[PDB]
Amino acid sequence: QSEAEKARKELLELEALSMAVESTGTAKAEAESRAEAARIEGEGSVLQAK
Amino acid sequence: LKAQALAIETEAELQRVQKVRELELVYARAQLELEVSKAQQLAEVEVKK
């Protein structure tokens, strides 16, 4: 069981890296989509105001 | 972007308000002249009577 835990430590490190990658990817994708939509809406608002 | 749009619309509204208010001021001055003319004429006729 000690040897199994020795391997499980590295396995958990890899799992943590994968989880961080997935979470940051999802968050950045949603944030960038919303930001692009807001920028387009703002430019349209400027033109409509003119 | 909101600041840009606000500046554009503010300048347009200010131009319109300035024109409207100057026209209203001219009309009010004319109305005041007419009112004072009528008042002084009626005062003159009643004083003479």
Q: Do B5 and A39 touch (CB under 8 A)?
A: no
Dihedral sign for Cα atoms in the order B11, B15, B21, B22:
positive
Dihedral sign for Cα atoms in the order A43, A46, A48, A50:
negative
User: Touching check for A34 and chain B: CB below 8 Å?
Assistant: no
CB-CB contact of B1 with A43 (8 Å)? yes
Tokens at residue A12, please?
């958990």
Tokens at residue B40, please?
């002084």
Resolution in A: 3.1
B19, amino acid identity: K
Residues of B whose CB is below 8 A from A39: 1
Q: Other CB atoms closer than 10 Å to residue A46's CB: what's the count?
A: 18
Solving technique: cryo-EM
Q: Do A45 and B1 touch (CB under 8 A)?
A: yes
Task: Write b or e for each residue in A15-42: b if 16 or more Cβ atoms lie within 10 A of its Cβ, otherwise e.
Answer: eeeeeeeeeeeeeeeeeeeeeeeeeeee
What is the distance between the alpha carbons of residues A8 and A23, in angstroms, rounded to a whole number? 22
Element (H, E) at B49: none
